């Protein structure tokens, strides 16, 4: 079986490294010399704007998934009809789109941050009102990382606010501060049938709006179930065949969805080595129409290298930790790799203090 | 760091997906559309009797392997001249050979099978006499799945033995047939310090000369040291770097050596889902300078898939089975793949049977 993955980028390189010991063949739409070039059949670079390339390139595999929510849905729309494409359409649409986000929740009695779509300045003034402060103006589209938003605690942030953000071509969104304690996230995977397989969930570290750490499992009966039922709701209603990832705030015994991403997701990194079948090679498993693997876990931290990455010949002296380059090139704010442990003695501690001593030395945030 | 594998099967395949996540970057030497290539930057086609190409194209490199041990030895010391080659010209040499391989063993007080150099008619008759029958001709060269051998029971079974095997190239050697319960392997890996990372012994089982399956830790701690005893005796005189294989027949407390292949070996298979770091992530480490990965190991069974594989659909229904499908072709006597399954539980031994019962269908041994 033939896969086509739009992306060339390090989550698609992932999915080959999973997927690949399964007899399955990876194929990817990108720029030549990006990371999942070596690892795959072949890279082909098309503009993603030429759609009837796009659909020409992907009728040429057996079923079609991506690694960015960011793209088009119309264009996925078209590939879908003429060669089955993973996840849908519309989880797309709904998950690229943080007002349509929000909005989904609010319409199936999911919690989220109050939030209101912002088209003027008023409109503005008037959630800050309404919803107060402190408060963040976001971009409906394209944020990543935390870039593409301002925070807003003063009046006069509100206008400065408006003022850098207001011709974003897809519009902004108002979110109040959510009151919360730490972060986790749902990963889960869908098969062709609708049985989901569930990972333990993960608690999610950020550091200036990017995630630095996650460890799993984290327990916490409670929890896990009221996110698995909220899996649950987003698969039916995105009629959902793919890896599916859900980050929430916590406060209490009570989850806040914060946002979702239609597919792997680096809060799950861990499970490459920390579960019998990762989000990787479960993803893949999905969307090729097999059943999914067993997703038994063990204690692992994942921890990301940002902008930076320390030597190798650092990194393998502490023998237990797993290493997880994207050969990607140094960068400020760039996520060229992650590292797991999995933790089970002192000996592991030990290690992990020294992976982070080495990850400080190494790692530029933006 | 760029590493060079002369070959592009199977092996070099599980090596580029081990090493790969280490931000390493691979290149074979071998035939396109070889089952490597999906997984490696390049494969370069070169008859390897061209010798001053191949050193050419060896220099491209930072350092150089190999996965197969039949080739020129002469070849890898030109190589090894020029850009560090692993493991050494003299494990080649020695391991390539029955008649070099046995004759080490001998001069360092270890044991074989009773072996003689068969270059007449007079000497294998000679060798009967002395060591009795049943018993062995087999190639000193090129001999691999127990091709290129005749067993010897009858005084008129010699006639015949010498008539097929006589106009062998590289010439002959007699072996008695060894009184044996079982066999085991013990594979280890040196790095460039000569430090060792240590596998437990897998119990290996064999179908018509082919390893059909392998278990993992062989729990006897009397026969592990014995092993790694052995082992440490090659790598210090190989000055061997990379992993290393060693199978054993196994009488009582007692080894007796059968052959070494100085390489990741199809009786480490296990090791990629048994393993805290495998075999092959190991091999890459030790040539590329890299401290060994902790080989922490967990009991883990492999099952070879040979001249077919079950269907990928059927094999995933067994969701805590590890799928690892060469992407070959499909062929009598072909290894095509081959089935990880750690056990813990019954509903472990539920799906090895289940696992044995699909290869059954789908085998197909020469
Ligand atoms: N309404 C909010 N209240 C508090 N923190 C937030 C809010 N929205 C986003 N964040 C932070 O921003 C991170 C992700 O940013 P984003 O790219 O907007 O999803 C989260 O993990 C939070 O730490
Ligand atoms: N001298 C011997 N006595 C008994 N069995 C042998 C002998 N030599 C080889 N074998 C069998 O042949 C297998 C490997 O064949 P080869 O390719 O010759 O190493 C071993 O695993 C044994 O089952």
New interface residues.
Partial sequence: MKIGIIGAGQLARML??AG????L??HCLGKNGDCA?????TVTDIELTKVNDVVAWAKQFDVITFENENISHELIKAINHEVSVYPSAKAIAISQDRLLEKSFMQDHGIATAKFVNIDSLAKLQSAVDDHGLPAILKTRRFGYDGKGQFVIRSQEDITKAWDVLKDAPDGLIYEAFVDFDYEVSQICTADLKGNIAFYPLARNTHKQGIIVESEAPFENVVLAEKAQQIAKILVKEFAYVGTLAIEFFVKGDELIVNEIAPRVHNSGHWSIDGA??SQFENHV?AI???????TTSRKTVMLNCIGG?PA??DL??L??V??????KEPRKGRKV?HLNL?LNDETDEYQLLQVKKLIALSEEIA
Avoid: Q, W
């Avoid at 797993?322 to 050969?327: A, E, F, G, M, R």
């Fill in positions: 080959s490294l690949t010991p399964l007899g063949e990876f070039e070596e690892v795959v059949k019998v079948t498993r090729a129409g097999l059943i999914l693997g067993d990455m190798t010949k393998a002296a023998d237990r797993k290493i997880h380059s994207y050969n790799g999995n």
